[PDB]
Design a protein around this nucleic acid. Structure first.
Lengths: 44, 49
RNA sequence: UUUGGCAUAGUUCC
């Protein structure tokens, strides 16, 4: 159930749109902003 | 004297003009009830307020 | 018959 090497994150789960809902003018959550920054750095 | 029966009250009462105040806290601004109303978005629990 | 959030301040009751 917990292999030691799995604790090194190489695949990052993305929570669904229910965990980070949009805001009604559409606003993005703190999680969404951090996800966007992370994927920006990752593709760079 | 008693109001309903008209008979004297045995104990004499202490009565006089005192200066009273009506505070801001009324009941029409505090009564509240709920039965299956609006519901929050993130948790899908009832709203607050 | 449709739903904003974060922060700060004040007040009520033990």
């Amino acid at each position: 159930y917990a292999r030691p090497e799995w604790m090194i994150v190489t695949v990052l789960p993305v929570p669904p749109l229910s965990v980070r809902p949009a805001v009604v003018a559409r606003n993005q959550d703190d999680l969404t902003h951090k996800l966007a920054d992370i994927v920006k750095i990752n593709n760079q | 004297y008693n109001g309903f029966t008209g008979r004297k009250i045995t104990s004499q009462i202490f009565i006089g003009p005192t200066y009273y105040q009506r505070l801001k806290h009324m009941v029409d601004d505090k009564i509240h009830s709920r039965a299956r109303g609006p519901i929050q978005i993130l948790n899908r629990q009832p709203m607050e307020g």
